């Protein structure tokens, strides 16, 4: 700007918006969905 008190105080980054939804939800996931085979 730089006035007032402003100064006083593909990529994987783009996919990381969606990728972090995988971190907190359902992992990826292979193993668990692979364990669900013989469950029922």
């Amino acid at each position: 700007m730089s006035e007032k008190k402003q100064p006083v105080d593909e990529d994987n980054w783009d996919d990381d918006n969606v990728e972090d939804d995988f971190s907190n939800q359902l992992r990826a996931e292979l193993e668990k969905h692979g364990y669900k085979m013989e469950t029922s």
Partner: protein
Amino acid sequence: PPGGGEQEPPPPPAPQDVEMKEEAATGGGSTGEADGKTAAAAAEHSQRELDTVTLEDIKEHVKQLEKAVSGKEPRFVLRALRMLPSTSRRLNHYVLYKAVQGFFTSNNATRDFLLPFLEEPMDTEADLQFRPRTGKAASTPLLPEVEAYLQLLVVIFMMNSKRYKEAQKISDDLMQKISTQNRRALDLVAAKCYYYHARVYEFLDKLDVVRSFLHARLRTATLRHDADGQATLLNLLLRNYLHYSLYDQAEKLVSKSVFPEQANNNEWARYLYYTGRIKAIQLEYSEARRTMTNALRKAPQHTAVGFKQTVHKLLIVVELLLGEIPDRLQFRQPSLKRSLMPYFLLTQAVRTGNLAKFNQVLDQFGEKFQADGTYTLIIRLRHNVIKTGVRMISLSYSRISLADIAQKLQLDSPEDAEFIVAKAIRDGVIEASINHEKGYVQSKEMIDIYSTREPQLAFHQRISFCLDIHNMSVKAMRFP
């Protein structure tokens, strides 16, 4: 010694070249620009001054360093004098004193001796015309010097600047008053120094009396001469009257007006962020989300660096209270990254309804939140996330049972779920009907919004928005 001794002479000519022609070409150019036309203003050199001072605020200011004695401050402030065309001799004498730094032993006339120097344009008998040039002579030497921040005995010289430049304010109000057009050029200069007013006080004590002195220049610009002047003064208000209590929130109602017309560009864009944090404490989210979003898209151009990034950090804070937010790393910058890491995973826990994950974010990352002062929302944001969690489920399902959504959102009990859904209907969040026996919740798909209703009714605001810009383009076309 001989190697570094011969390299001392060359640099000081560089401030004797560009820094000379800084106020020689602009100041000598703005001379005839401020004598007439003077439309508006314009006086584009005052806006060119924005491309100098802000450029000088990095390098070189007046000083520097660079390997001179800091003799440019006394040079231009002496021997104004001035008169008819012999003012060129003053610029010629400014060239004559350039050799004094390179030939004889150089002496520093700044600081202690700068007190009578600011009186010299008055002592030269006389100025005789432009206060903004002397205001520049009482600012550009001293105000860029404030960036040193040594805090010892020169802060009162920064106050002596705010003194003798208040004597320029005495000449601002008393002199002219009729088709001035220097005040509108000074409204850029008076802004800055009033910004430096606030800045210098923040290092010692916040200004109690200047708050009364702010309303002085505030109210007196109305209605006689106001262009962009009261807006910058209103920026001083909402800036500090925010960070300090109290009652200043609702104060915006009686002041506005707007104040029109918004100037200059991004300068008013940040103003919507100021009142944006205000309206965030009013708890109204909808008016806060539009003024914050407009604050980013209306703000050019940066760089550098985190001044626009930090203001954008706390800008999306209203989006945390909206209940609908995506992952904010799409707004992340490699420079802002390291600073937003405690504030990053926060919104990542907002997208989820887990209490153990949300409370762990508050414990570890609460230290970063102390500097922001955002703790007001953390108590009401728990009620915001539970609305996002139920909206995620209610939009994903037709019917949602209270017992199944009980532990899934871990409300843990049927009774408080009846209290939340009740208040969810009171807030218009959910349309779900509830059949109470045990009980359970049985909802149904909401429809009939259709086509003929919402889009064509919203297009009334879309075209009225577009047809006004047709006038905005014509108005902007009429000036050339």
